[PDB]
Amino acid sequence: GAMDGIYSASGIDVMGILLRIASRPNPTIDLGPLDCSVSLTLCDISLPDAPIVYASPGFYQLTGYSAPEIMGRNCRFLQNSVSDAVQEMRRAIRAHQEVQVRIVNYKKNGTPFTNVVTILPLWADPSGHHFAVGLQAEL
Template structure:
């Protein structure tokens, strides 16, 4: 406990008890006549100190938690301080009583708890990332895609719009893996993922189903013209993916066969839309094989 005289310049301490001597790491004769700011340091919370000073200037009670420093060695400790005004019979503010409590262990426990919560959240975020994203490309995986596509259809139903689904399969990917190895195949898949993301609108979704198969969801397309819009985007993506990819072991090239399905024409759930787009993708692939033959 302390008492300071606010009628004198710099509001010096006029009383300290032995408990405060221990907290401050100094004897009473070293403390009396000084302002309590000697407990502060460069890491003390400036706004909290400002709030205390404002309360004292206004003659109000206040409670703050401050980082203070003890003794000549300036050992840090956390001070939960409560200050209350004392008025004389004429209502004039003459003193402030301060009650100080060392809450260092409590603060440290709170910090440890916060750190543990952060670690737990980081772990949960990583678990969610692994559960819903492809580990190679970082794209949403099939599980996440199903949730997003169902949500997209629901939004389209409410808004009276449509949605298009593009099923992409890379022609020639197996040959790249066989000739150059799986490391180059992974480089190619990363390049494909990047090109797809760069050429889609904000709000469009690209996901990796697995292997060399990708799916693109185009929300909020015209309900009747969604197939035309989907095929237009599919042609643009096919052109982008046909460009050669430079890898650590040389330049490789693949093409994409892309099938398009639309809501509501081809269904209203994940399985129906995926199945229709998959069938059309294989029709594109088959027609190319016939043409090549």
């Protein structure tokens, strides 16, 4: 039992999330391949204002932020050092629909980028937690 969870330092089971992605009915977006450098956030929609409960190394690398600086915050801070992508994401998330947009975001140093953002709200799990996954990519 000393090896329980040694392959997730966060104790988050991202692979559980991957399984949900693959199992979703009526998938509308194909992610294509993901590797371990992927920018990825998990937000708990079951908590008020969809706070970040996990971000991959790839997200920190993309944005220049660190864990204490972003954990527990809504992803919208990325939009500031407004776009119709914002409302497209708001509405999709509300309907629990998959959505993909391009939108201008900003790294910690204030540098703007065009971020290709995919959000899969997925679903509330029997515990009631509701992990939404977002993937980011600088184009």
